[PDB]
């Protein structure tokens, strides 16, 4: 019943994850109840054959930080039926982060969360640092944006 979920099509679809990013990538499969499930990670600059299914939903994140990534330039990837045996490519890339959110990523990577509020930075940035990327919060946002359309 959730808007973002795989459909149990049982129709096989061969797919190739291509990590065209400098991050270790965590593929995330939305199950038939919309719950995110992790799959084995992908080193930067590597590809992998996947046995997926038509109408399943995938998304991709940085494995260590859960920074959001894009797949074929969008948030979600849905396998289609293979045409003439050719697998479907999922080209995973960095998005264009805002400079602010790219700066937050670097600071998070260097500062333990217990130490954020020791930094001599403007106060509103403490909460920005604490509001780290989160798959379920992103799924709720994508759901709301979809309803709006």
């Amino acid at each position: 019943r959730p808007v973002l979920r795989s459909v149990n099509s049982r129709e096989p679809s061969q797919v190739i994850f291509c990590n065209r990013s400098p991050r270790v990538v965590l593929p995330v499969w939305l199950n038939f109840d919309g719950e995110p499930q992790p799959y084995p990670t992908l080193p930067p600059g590597t590809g992998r054959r996947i046995h997926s299914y038509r109408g399943h939903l995938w998304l991709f994140r940085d494995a260590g930080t859960h920074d959001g990534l894009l797949v074929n330039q969008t948030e979600l990837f849905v396998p289609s039926l293979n045409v003439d045996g050719q697998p479907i490519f999922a080209n995973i890339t960095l998005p264009v982060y805002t400079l602010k959110e790219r700066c937050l990523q670097v600071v998070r990577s260097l500062v333990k969360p217990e130490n954020y509020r020791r930094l001599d930075i403007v106060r509103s940035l403490y909460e920005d640092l604490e509001d780290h990327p989160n798959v379920q919060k992103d799924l709720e946002r994508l759901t709301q944006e979809r309803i709006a359309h």
Partner: peptide, 16 residues
């Protein structure tokens, strides 16, 4: 019956 995605035991390949 629910069929989840799976990964064939196969080597990864390098992109260039």
């Amino acid at each position: 019956e629910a069929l989840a995605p799976y990964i064939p035991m196969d080597d990864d390949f390098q992109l260039r």
